[PDB]
Design a protein around this ligand. Structure first.
Ligand SMILES: CC(C)CCC[C@@H](C)CCC[C@@H](C)CCC[C@@H](C)CCOC[C@@H](COP(=O)([O-])OC[C@H](O)COP(=O)([O-])O)OCC[C@H](C)CCC[C@H](C)CCC[C@H](C)CCCC(C)C
Ligand SMILES: CC(C)CCC[C@@H](C)CCC[C@@H](C)CCC[C@@H](C)CCOC[C@@H](COP(=O)([O-])OC[C@H](O)COP(=O)([O-])O)OCC[C@H](C)CCC[C@H](C)CCC[C@H](C)CCCC(C)C
Ligand SMILES: CC(C)CCC[C@@H](C)CCC[C@@H](C)CCC[C@@H](C)CCOC[C@@H](COP(=O)([O-])OC[C@H](O)COP(=O)([O-])O)OCC[C@H](C)CCC[C@H](C)CCC[C@H](C)CCCC(C)C
Ligand SMILES: CC(C)CCC[C@@H](C)CCC[C@@H](C)CCC[C@@H](C)CCOC[C@@H](COP(=O)(O)OC[C@H](O)CO)OCC[C@H](C)CCC[C@H](C)CCC[C@H](C)CCCC(C)C
Ligand SMILES: CC(C)CCC[C@@H](C)CCC[C@@H](C)CCC[C@@H](C)CCOC[C@@H](COP(=O)(O)OC[C@H](O)CO)OCC[C@H](C)CCC[C@H](C)CCC[C@H](C)CCCC(C)C
Ligand SMILES: CC(C)CCC[C@@H](C)CCC[C@@H](C)CCC[C@@H](C)CCOC[C@@H](COP(=O)(O)OC[C@H](O)CO)OCC[C@H](C)CCC[C@H](C)CCC[C@H](C)CCCC(C)C
Ligand SMILES: CC(C)CCC[C@@H](C)CCC[C@@H](C)CCC[C@@H](C)CCOC[C@@H](COP(=O)(O)O)OCC[C@H](C)CCC[C@H](C)CCC[C@H](C)CCCC(C)C
Ligand SMILES: CC(C)CCC[C@@H](C)CCC[C@@H](C)CCC[C@@H](C)CCOC[C@@H](COP(=O)(O)O)OCC[C@H](C)CCC[C@H](C)CCC[C@H](C)CCCC(C)C
Ligand SMILES: CC(C)CCC[C@@H](C)CCC[C@@H](C)CCC[C@@H](C)CCOC[C@@H](COP(=O)(O)O)OCC[C@H](C)CCC[C@H](C)CCC[C@H](C)CCCC(C)C
Ligand SMILES: CC(C)CCC[C@@H](C)CCC[C@@H](C)CCC[C@@H](C)CCOC[C@@H](CO)OCC[C@H](C)CCC[C@H](C)CCC[C@H](C)CCCC(C)C
Ligand SMILES: *C/C=C(C)/C=C/C=C(C)/C=C/C1=C(C)CCCC1(C)C
Ligand SMILES: *C/C=C(C)/C=C/C=C(C)/C=C/C1=C(C)CCCC1(C)C
Ligand SMILES: *C/C=C(C)/C=C/C=C(C)/C=C/C1=C(C)CCCC1(C)C
Lengths: 229, 229, 229
């Protein structure tokens, strides 16, 4: 890995403030909302960064960090990420499903594929045998591919049969999640959890940009449109 | 903290019997119920103490206790509480939401705010740095405040547009949960998990009275009325 | 217990392939399905073995094994089972509930009774005091009995008021789960997690036959009928 339990601190601390202020913004905003549908969109979307803040704080305060022996060392693995992402990604996926109006069957498949992507990714992070950490990465990425597939050629189709304001916001969000989401298995692979090419200092800066984007950025695009009505 | 892994035993054992008999009572009672709505109320309400019993038993049998180093010692932290409360409090919140007929958006916000209250409280209990245990307590209590706010000025409003039998049972329950619930962060703060003013022996007696009340007491008020129909 | 962290490997590895190919089969099959109801059945049913594969792999790769001191030794406890079963059994129970069209109250009772059966079984597996491991087993089995009761004299009744194709597939599935499910507490009791009569080598072969049957076998009976429409 890339030994780091203090230099990344600034990024952990900044991600804490951003997620923290991101929650605050969505909070002091859905406040007016009377429409039960928009009400659901603000609920899901506000909860995403709210969970992100607590876990980002845990990593900053040191709780979210653990040490796992693999290779020929003891590696600094921030597990709070998996704790965050486990509820955050299925919540993000529900916004997309509600927006486009997906079947209860597909929403269950997606949440299921997602829980598996995060749990499997968690087992990979905590696995002591260097070689095996890549098997789980393979299985985790495979599930993401399954998820990004229906989001693309599946939700897109169900979108075009909705009001244009809705068809387009989804278009924008769809692109943002498919692009952002696929960066995690890459950062993970080259980062301190896989082939230690990139230092934890950097891995943490990357995850931060992606997180704030995948949640607050995403939330902004959504919450600031009439598609949620 | 307040070193204790045997004197509180009587309270752990009594809370076990009470939760145990509380489940039994609700069990041999919803037995007749044919109304699918009352059927849901008995389901949720019976599951609350049923979960409470197992966790109370774990603490009595010693499993639910762990030791966390903070201050200048090794402190006896009963973590089973957080394991219990994590499912129990959202279940309790669903009874109130069903009774008053809340929006899927607000129920999601509440369960979300609640999961955060318990998890955050759990991180606070397990945190080794004395100072930080209070940050999480602050964040956990803040979420409770958010929860007790909608239960009060939110559910109350939605209650008044229901049959009077319903409007009033909620009134009673609302008061019981807002009053009881806000005692936990106080007991926690002065107890062995925070400023060790109160001994674990006592902290455990308090949590017991509050638990049995917040669940069996609460359940009795609810299940023994026609509001569940 | 029955010391084993390598001879059972072949069964762990075989259960991995079977669950793996079982998922694959259901995958390249619900592919056509346009009916949102059948769509839900394929979702739930495919997710069951998909989760089973990951956990079976964890046990094979060594991650799902831990050592618990009880009796006068350090016993090899495969905890991944409880991780698997926690989502898998409630999912299996939802197929039965959807098929027969159960009330939201009873589905909640069942999932609740089930979470308790697995968690309680998990506490029993991890408990260091030999004597106590049987208390949890008693509580876990009691919950299973509650579950198998409604599946039998409860769902059966609700089945007979459905299309005959549906009434019968449920009949078959009902029998398969009640029979298979009740074998787990027996295997557990005589296996390495309880009265070490049976060696881990064998306990693992038994759990494997039961798992593949309870999921892939079950799934086949269901997915290969028109009852899911
Ligand atoms: C309701 C109340 C609630 C909303 C209030 C929340 C306040 C909460 C944000 C305060 C956070 O307060 C953070 C603390 C700790 O900051 P540290 O010095 O960086 O800690 C490093 C530690 O030793 C472990 O490091 P390791 O993980 O690398 O091993 O004060 C240090 C504060 C930081 C200097 C500023 C951080 C600002 C946050 C973004 C907020
Ligand atoms: C279906 C079957 C199922 C319903 C039956 C459930 C029975 C179950 C309640 C029996 C419980 O049985 C409890 C046992 C243990 O009681 P102990 O002596 O107090 O154990 C202390 C331990 O050493 C750790 O203490 P530490 O946590 O402080 O470190 O018998 C001691 C029994 C107690 C003396 C009585 C307790 C009664 C319970 C309320 C029941
Ligand atoms: C998307 C990509 C994804 C679908 C691909 C998945 C491939 C994945 C199945 C490969 C599995 O690959 C398995 C590995 C390890 O097998 P081992 O030698 O048996 O490991 C024992 C270990 O030391 C701990 O044992 P302990 O738990 O008893 O302590 O290769 C050994 C391979 C085995 C010899 C073959 C197993 C086949 C599996 C059924 C597949
Ligand atoms: C239909 C089928 C036929 C196909 C289905 C299965 C197939 C699609 C799966 C193929 C890919 C999948 C197996 C996973 C492969 C992951 C791939 C990206 C390789 C990752 O590989 C990562 C490297 C790590 O390198 P270091 O050891 O640190 O040394 C370099 C140092 O940083 C300097 O090792 C690599 C070590 C090992 C290569 C890890 C593999 C275990
Ligand atoms: C809009 C904004 C401006 C306001 C938003 C933020 C604001 C609302 C938050 C204020 C409160 C929040 C920060 C949390 C404060 C918790 C408060 C109850 C203080 C708890 O404080 C507990 C004590 C513990 O005392 P001992 O060390 O054991 O010694 C005494 C011994 O028992 C005898 O320490 C206390 C030690 C430290 C004081 C703990 C703090 C960390
Ligand atoms: C209405 C009420 C009156 C009735 C409600 C409660 C009642 C229904 C509950 C009765 C059953 C319940 C208490 C659980 C009993 C479990 C029962 C199957 C006994 C299991 O018992 C397992 C054995 C383990 O044997 P080894 O020590 O390994 O030595 C043998 C070695 O293998 C050779 O010990 C056994 C040791 C102890 C017997 C374990 C018990 C604790
Ligand atoms: C720093 C931060 C990160 C700390 C973390 C705390 C955090 C864990 C708790 C917050 C939980 C949130 C993440 C949960 C998501 C909340 C969103 C879903 C809210 C969306 O809106 C849902 C509605 C539900 O009511 P209706 O059915 O009537 O429409 O909120 C009802 C709207 C209400 C009626 C209007 C007022 C709402 C405000 C926000 C609540 C009042 C604030 C409380 C009194 C706490 C005050 C703070 C303390 C310190 C005094
Ligand atoms: C000591 C205790 C704490 C041990 C803990 C065990 C515990 C974990 C398991 C219990 C799980 C419960 C907490 C789950 C909540 C249960 C409540 C929701 C029940 C509410 O009612 C729901 C209905 C569902 O059926 P319908 O759709 O037809 O209406 O129950 C159907 C009603 C049925 C049809 C009538 C009979 C119901 C009884 C209660 C079930 C029979 C009991 C079993 C045969 C076990 C017997 C005991 C063994 C030792 C012989
Ligand atoms: C070896 C294995 C065990 C690795 C484990 C990975 C695993 C964790 C991920 C799989 C998750 C699954 C368990 C989740 C269950 C999936 C089932 C519910 C699918 C049932 O069907 C649901 C529909 C939803 O779309 P509609 O609403 O339009 O009907 O699937 C939509 C049908 C789509 C539109 C048709 C094509 C579906 C295929 C299966 C998806 C394409 C495959 C991806 C491109 C990944 C390709 C593999 C990589 C290596 C190239
Ligand atoms: C086993 C015990 C069950 C016993 C109460 C018998 C219940 O049987 C009557 C049911 C209707 O089926 O309602 C019972 C409704 C009765 C009118 C109310 C009786 C309540 C009793 C006072 C028992 C209260 C026990 C506490 C709730 C548990 C505190 C420990
Ligand atoms: C707010 C957080 C978001 C949107 C996070 C998304 C995270 C992922 C898509 C993670 C994917 C992973 C893999 C595909 C394999 C390796 C491990 C993970 C967990 C990093
Ligand atoms: C049956 C159990 C009930 C109703 C429990 C309710 C528990 C709480 C409201 C706990 C609140 C907490 C805080 C507000 C902060 C400190 C930590 C907790 C978890 C004790
Ligand atoms: C796919 C897996 C299935 C269908 C598993 C079912 C498992 C059980 C019914 C387990 C039951 C247990 C008890 C009744 C008590 C002892 C512990 C358990 C968890 C083995």
């Amino acid at each position: 890995a890339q030994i780091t339990g203090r230099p990344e601190w600034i990024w952990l601390a900044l991600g804490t403030a951003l997620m923290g202020l991101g929650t605050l913004y969505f909070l002091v905003k859905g406040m007016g909302v009377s429409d039960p549908d928009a009400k659901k969109f603000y609920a899901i979307t506000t909860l995403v960064p709210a969970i992100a803040f607590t876990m980002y704080l845990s990593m900053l305060l040191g709780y979210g960090l653990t040490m796992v022996p693999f290779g020929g060392e003891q590696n600094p693995i921030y597990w709070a990420r998996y704790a965050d992402w486990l509820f955050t990604t299925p919540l993000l996926l529900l916004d997309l499903a509600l927006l486009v109006d997906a079947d209860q069957g597909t929403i269950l498949a997606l949440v299921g594929a997602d829980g598996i992507m995060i749990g499997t990714g968690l087992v990979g992070a905590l696995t002591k045998v260097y070689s095996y950490r890549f098997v789980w990465w393979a299985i985790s990425t495979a599930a993401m591919l399954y998820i990004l597939y229906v989001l693309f050629f599946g939700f897109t189709s169900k979108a075009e049969s909705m009001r244009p304001e809705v068809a387009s916001t989804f278009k924008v969000l769809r692109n943002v999640t498919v692009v952002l989401w696929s960066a995690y298995p890459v950062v993970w692979l080259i980062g301190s959890e896989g082939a230690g090419i990139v230092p934890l200092n950097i891995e943490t800066l990357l995850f931060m940009v992606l997180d704030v984007s995948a949640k607050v950025g995403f939330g902004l695009i959504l919450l600031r449109s009439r598609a949620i009505f």
